[PDB]
């Protein structure tokens, strides 16, 4: 089976930040740069 990413899957970085994807937003909802480039992931600062 070919598994895409879905709500409930676990992501983590190498520095010990770990979390579950809680929301998949459509591209238009995503915070973007002035040139129109959207971001893939929104991390919470409170975790740092």
């Amino acid at each position: 089976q070919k598994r895409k990413l879905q709500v409930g899957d676990k992501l983590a970085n190498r520095h010990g930040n770990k979390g579950v994807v809680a929301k998949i937003l459509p591209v238009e909802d995503m915070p973007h740069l002035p040139d129109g480039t959207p971001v893939d992931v929104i991390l919470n600062p409170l975790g740092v």
């Binding site: 929301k23 915070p31 919470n44 600062p45």
Partner: protein
């Protein structure tokens, strides 16, 4: 249960010295260890999500 597969990184006729990469293993990109994706992140709270 993860799928372990190798993929060829070279092409017909290519000259290769000793130790050059031929096939890319699982979780490997051009001989470098690949455990995930490089994504563009923004660090801000978002609507309690």
């Amino acid at each position: 249960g993860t799928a372990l597969d190798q993929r060829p990184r070279v092409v017909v006729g290519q000259r290769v010295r000793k130790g050059d990469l031929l096939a890319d293993g699982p979780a490997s990109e051009n001989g470098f260890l690949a455990l995930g994706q490089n994504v563009l992140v923004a660090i801000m709270p978002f609507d309690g999500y």
